[PDB]
């Protein structure tokens, strides 16, 4: 399992083992983020497990990850949905294709990514992988956005940045 | 360190080593919770360290702890402010003397407490203790309360419970005034 290093432009130039790649000096690599909603339109919010190298124990959107070499973004979502949440989904739809961001977590671990964002509906029940998720909540998107707007610090900076992009919010909202 | 055990009614009966007292079977003991505001009236919110036995990595109010034998509640507040946050404060005011709290954390660890709540002003700069606090923010109380109502599940349950108590909340509000 690896991450894909990107040069100044989004061109892959090689790979790194996933664990070894997230450091205090993380280099730009390829990733995804997705927001999941159930049949009713509830958003799934998850809390990262305390064993995650980056942002452990942090509340964030439904699922995020690292596409492997030759893997489509959409396949990557599907894979991590199965792996982290044991859940089936509908074809992921683009919500924020040009999201790119760098941030530092409270222990100094950095994420540095070209991270296209997706949305999908779940088609099965969750089956939680507690190596990845320690808690989660099904909730109204409206409420989630309010909490992000009032106390953004309570959420992953990654979730906050995506939810505050005007178009991404529209599309998440239109997603219901 | 230890905790002070309380019987079926809130009366002390002795002490228990602190680690050993916090389990899936935690017996009632004494605790405190305090909400701190800077001169500007902003509230300090903190994120519990990942190594805390109970609610690790969770966003919560300013400071909480366990009074020791011979120690007043208000002295315990002073001490943990100093220990956890490196910070000097004004005399703690009692804002919810009757708060009681029993709850299980994400891993099964139980807290079961008589936990009077306080408010105070910080009088010095912070010196965060990373063994106790992994993150923090200075915030407007209004914003914190709005976030708590919108996504209460993202915060420690004690913080939500205290902030939703009517009389306590009025006291937090009073501490948002700017003071010189
Ligand atoms: C964390 C992010 O920077 C927010 Br987009 C994306 C990476 O996902 P990740 O959860 O870190 O990856 P993984 O699921 O494999 O742990
Ligand atoms: C969390 C509480 O149930 C507040 Br209701 C009391 C425990 O605080 P604590 O910070 O965990 O205690 P300590 O600082 O002494 O370790
Ligand atoms: Mg992931
Ligand atoms: Mg404490
Ligand atoms: Mn990464
Ligand atoms: Mn306790």
The full set of domains in chain A, from first to last, is 1-176 (3.90.79.10)
Long-range contacts from B53-56, C-beta under 8 angstroms, 24+ separation: B53/B19, B53/B22, B53/B109, B54/B22, B54/B105, B54/B109, B54/B110, B54/B111, B55/B105, B55/B106, B55/B156, B56/A50, B56/A57
Interface contact flag, B45 A147, Cβ < 8 Å = no
Written as six digits, the tokens of A157 are: 């900076």
Q: How far is the C-alpha of A39 from the C-alpha of B17, rounded, in Å?
A: 49
Decide: A159 and A62 in contact? Cβ < 8 Å: no
Nearest atom in ligand 2 to B99's CA: 5
Ligand 5 centroid to Cα of residue A58, in Å, is: 15
Q: Does B133 touch chain A (CB under 8 A)?
A: no
Q: Of B113, B116, B123, nearest to B171 (Cα)?
A: B116
Number of A–B residue contacts, CB under 8 Å: 63
Nearest atom in ligand 1 to A55's CA: 1
B59 lines ligand 2 (CB under 6 A): no
CB-based neighbours (< 5 A) of ligand 5, an ion: A 111
Question: Please, which residues bridge with residue B155 across strands?
Answer: B59
Q: Beta strand B32-37 with B117-121: parallel, antiparallel or unpaired?
A: parallel
Q: How far is the C-alpha of B66 from the C-alpha of B41, rounded, in Å?
A: 26
Q: Of B114, B127, B106, B146, nearest to B31 (Cα)?
A: B114
Helix (H, G, I), strand (E, B) or coil at A110: strand
Interface contact flag, A150 B147, Cβ < 8 Å = yes
Q: How far is the C-alpha of B40 from the C-alpha of B179, rounded, in Å?
A: 6
Query: A133 Cβ partners below 8 Å, 6+ apart?
Result: A46, A47, A48, A49, A84, A85
Written as six digits, the tokens of B104 are: 């299980």
Decide: B64 and B76 in contact? Cβ < 8 Å: no
């Amino acid at each position: 399992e690896h991450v894909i290093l990107l040069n100044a432009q989004g061109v892959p130039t090689g790979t790194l083992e996933k664990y070894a790649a997230h450091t205090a000096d993380t280099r730009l690599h390829l990733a995804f983020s997705s927001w999941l909603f159930n049949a009713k339109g509830q958003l799934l919010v998850t809390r990262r497990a305390l064993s995650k190298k980056a942002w452990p124990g942090v509340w964030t959107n439904s699922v995020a990850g690292h596409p492997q070499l030759g893997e489509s973004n959409e396949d990557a979502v599907i894979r991590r949905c199965r792996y982290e949440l044991g859940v089936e989904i509908t074809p992921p739809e683009s919500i924020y294709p040009d999201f790119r961001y760098r941030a530092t977590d409270p222990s100094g671990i950095v994420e540095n990514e070209v991270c296209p964002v997706f949305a999908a509906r779940t088609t099965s029940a969750l089956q939680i992988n507690d190596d990845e998720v320690m808690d989660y909540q099904w909730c109204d998107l409206a409420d989630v956005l309010h909490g992000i707007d009032a106390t953004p610090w309570a959420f992953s900076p990654w979730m906050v940045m995506q939810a505050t992009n005007r178009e991404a919010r529209k599309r998440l909202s239109a997603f219901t």
